[PDB]
Structure formats: C-alpha cells, structure tokens
C-alpha cells in the first residue's frame, strides 16, 4: 500500500544544566524502529524493531556518526536563533525537525519533507518542489540565506528522491510480514451510570495497527458528532494502538445507540451496541 519513512529531531536547551540535549527517532509508518539520545553516556543509534537489527555494523556506526554531528549542529543552530531574536540565554528553547518521504503502492515518491519548528512554531520548511524554502519571519529569512548559499535544497532533494526511497523500500522488504499487516481492532462497549437521568456509553477499540481509525456513535442511524467524546489514540506498548469514544445518553434509552468502527484491517465497518 502507501508507506512513509520519517525522522524526528528535537534539540532542547537547558540553561545552567548542561549543553542542549538532542534526540532522534525513526519511523516507518506507525512503527518506531530506531533511536538516539545524546544524554546516553556513549550515545549510539539503537534498533527498536526486529527487522532493522539485521543491519550491519557499518550501518550502525554511520548512523551514530550522523546523530553525533547533528547534536553539535543543533546546539549551534539554537545559539544562532537566540542571537537573531535577541533572546536571553536564561530562557529554555526548542528546535525540532521532521523529514522523510512518502510513497504509494508502486514504490513511487509522492512527497518529500523537511521542515523546522523553533519553540513549537513553524520556522522554515522545504517546499514540495524540493527547490524553494518558505520562511516564517525575518529571522528565518536569515537562515534561508545560509541554506541557499550552501545549496542545501538540492542535496536534500537528491536524498529524498533516491536514498530515502531506497531505504524505505528495503525496510518494507525486510520487515514485510509485520509492516504490511493490518491488525483489526478488538471491540466492545462499556456502560457507566452517571445520575438518575443519564449514563455514559463507551465504545472501545484495542490492539489495532496502524493507528488511523474512526469511532462513531449513532442513534439509531444518525451520528452524534457534536456529542461524542474522543480520546487521542494511544499506543499499547506492543506496537498496537488503543482508542475510545463515549456518549452521554439518558437512563433507559441505551438501546437506540450504536457504535461504529472503521479500520483498514476491517473489510466492513463494525457495528456494536450495549
């Protein structure tokens, strides 16, 4: 089907408590497979999926070295941003980055990504043409002068069109059994009396992969969009996800409500009831 690979970089400064910290995690779709934390005493890239473990030592040392150099680079970027904005070194600051590639079923590239956020707000992003940059403000325009002078776009482009795609295709092959699988959610409903007059109906979805899912409450055919309480989808710790939706209904009228679940592991939407 359609797949993606993504890296997430975070550097956070911590004034009077060390040099800024740097972490990297890698994802193939909803699957964590690799990690790095500059706080670990001899920081190294470590596997987090059975199918990246076969990768050889040349791989793990190369990756570690990438991670180590980024640690220093991000520390320097933080310093430069702080200077652009005239910010105090007493203040904590964060710089994030997501980048990677999206492909479809043929293995074709559909989109490349590479954008930064400073303190949780978009800072500068590589546009979809993989040639131009969008800068948020005048500070970022300074950054853009730097990234243009160093022809960063073109090198990024080359990576996103070739190497990134080739790595994802390889990972998909090596861990095909578990990465191409669709684990359908296990379902049930729970009831919780509130008052004399009402109660809560909760619809549950557990053990599903990937994370994308839709839970709806109906009565008895119309959706209570405005009245359905959703929780953020959460990981179970075992590669799978969990999620629930709840409705407050009047005591005695439970029978007219149905819960409906949609998930790519389900050929047909599921109906559930109390």
């Amino acid at each position: 089907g359609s797949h993606s690979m993504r890296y997430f970089h975070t550097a956070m400064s911590r004034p009077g408590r060390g040099e800024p910290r740097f972490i990297t995690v890698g994802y193939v779709d909803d699957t964590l497979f690799v990690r790095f934390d500059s706080d670990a005493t001899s920081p190294r890239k470590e596997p987090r999926a059975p199918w990246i473990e076969q990768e050889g030592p040349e791989y793990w040392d190369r990756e570690t070295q990438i991670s180590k150099t980024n640690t220093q680079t991000y520390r320097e970027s933080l310093r430069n941003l702080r200077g652009y904005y005239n910010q105090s070194e007493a203040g904590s600051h964060t710089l994030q980055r997501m980048y990677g590639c999206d492909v479809g079923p043929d293995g074709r590239l559909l989109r490349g990504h590479n954008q930064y956020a400073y303190d949780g707000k978009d800072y500068i992003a590589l546009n979809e043409d993989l040639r131009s940059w969008t800068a948020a403000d005048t500070a970022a325009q300074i950054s853009q002068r730097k990234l243009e002078a160093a022809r960063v776009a073109e090198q990024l482009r080359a990576y996103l069109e070739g190497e990134c795609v080739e790595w994802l295709r390889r990972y998909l092959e090596n861990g095909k059994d578990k990465l191409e699988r669709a684990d359908p959610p296990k379902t049930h409903v729970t009831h919780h009396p509130i008052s004399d007059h009402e109660a809560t109906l909760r619809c549950w979805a557990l053990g599903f992969y990937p994370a994308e899912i839709t839970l709806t409450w109906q009565r008895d055919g119309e959706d209570q969009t405005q009245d359905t309480e959703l929780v953020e989808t959460r990981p179970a710790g075992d590669r799978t996800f969990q999620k629930w939706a709840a409705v407050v209904v009047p005591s005695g009228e439970e029978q007219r409500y149905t819960c409906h679940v949609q998930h790519e592991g389900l050929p047909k939407p599921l109906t559930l009831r109390w």
Binding site: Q65, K68, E163, C164
Partner: peptide, 10 residues
C-alpha cells in the same frame, strides 16, 4: 537510513 547532511546550519 538518515541523510548524511548532518551539518545543516540555521
């Protein structure tokens, strides 16, 4: 595999 462009300086 990450991009080896580890000297991307803002």
């Amino acid at each position: 595999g990450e991009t080896a462009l580890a000297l991307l300086l803002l």
